Each structure stands twice: as structure tokens, then as C-alpha cells.
Amino acid sequence: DDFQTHIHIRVEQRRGRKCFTTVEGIPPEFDYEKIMKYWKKWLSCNATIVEEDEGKKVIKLNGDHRNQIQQFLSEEGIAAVDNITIHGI
RNA sequence: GGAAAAAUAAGUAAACCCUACCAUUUGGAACAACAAGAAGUCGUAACAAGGUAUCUGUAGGUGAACCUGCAGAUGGAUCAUUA
Ligand SMILES: [Mg+2]
Numbered sequence A: 001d002d003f004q005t006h007i008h009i010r011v012e013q014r015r016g017r018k019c020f021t022t023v024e025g026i027p028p029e030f031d032y033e034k035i036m037k038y039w040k041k042w043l044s045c046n047a048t049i050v051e052e053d054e055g056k057k058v059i060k061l062n063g064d065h066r067n068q069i070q071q072f073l074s075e076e077g078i079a080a081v082d083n084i085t086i087h088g089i
Numbered sequence B: 001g002g003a004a005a006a007a008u009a010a011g012u013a014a015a016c017c018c019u020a021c022c023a024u025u026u027g028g029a030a031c032a033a034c035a036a037g038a039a040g041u042c043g044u045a046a047c048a049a050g051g052u053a054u055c056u057g058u059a060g061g062u063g064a065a066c067c068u069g070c071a072g073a074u075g076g077a078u079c080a081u082u083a
């Protein structure tokens, strides 16, 4: 019964020292399209919604604002502070 | 007959109040705003034709620098080619 929402925040190296923040685990409820926008202006970086495996929708922005995002999804509510994961090396 | 107090009207007009307006100073705050700086963060606009150019005006859009349409100017990557 994995109904709960488990959000994964990834941090990838896409070039020398340039990083990527990845957010996967956002319920389809609210379309990312509108979170793509806000996050772009929020952190000031380019976003992209990547969709691997037909159903799973992922937000892939450049940087490393995981600290921000978790603080964002929680403060907002779209994701309870507990269920949010920070896979950070 | 002179003549003190008192009282009188018009007058000069102190102060005071109300109604407008001027001048000179001085005041004010969270959030906001502005100023300056950097190997903060994201990208790369501009110089190099700096990915096939900048730039002016106006218009519209955009995380950001900016892109794009129409019209110009070279301060351009031409001072030049009917045989
Ligand atoms: Mg700077």
C-alpha cells in the first residue's frame, strides 16, 4: 500500500562542476508546468520536465537548490516534510 | 467761568479665533526601495563575422543576459566589377 507520496530530490553532475536538481515524486495533482515556471524565477535557473517511464514526471532544473525545494514543497504543503528525500552526496 | 470721575460716536488698532494660502525648517516604519562589491547562483548577451554582426526607434514576449517583427545607420566582418 504505497499510496503515500515519496519525493526524491536528485543531484547530478551534468558538466565539470555544473549541477542538476531533479525532483521526482510529485503527484500529478498539480501540473509541474506551473511549478516549472515558479521555480525558474524562484531560484533563477533553467528547468525542464523530463518524463521517463510514461507515467513518472520529473522536474530537472540546473543548480542545487534541494535545500530550497524541500523547504519549498513543505512550506507549501504539496508534500509533507517527512515524505521528502534528499539524495545528496 | 475754568474743571476732575463717568458716559458717547466715528477712528487708529493691540491681542485672540475662524477660513484660505505662502515661505523656511524638521520628521517617519516592518516589508519594500536605492547604493556599492565579489573566483556567490544560472546561463552566456557583447568584443572575435563572439555561431554567420552589432546598434537606434517602436512593438510583443521571456528564469536572466535577451529573442523576435517592421524601418534605419555604419561607427561593419565591402570604400571596388553589365563586358
Ligand atoms: Mg556578477
Ligand SMILES: [Mg+2]
Binding pocket: none
Ligand atoms: Mg531591437
Ligand SMILES: [Mg+2]
Binding pocket: none
Ligand atoms: Mg519592452
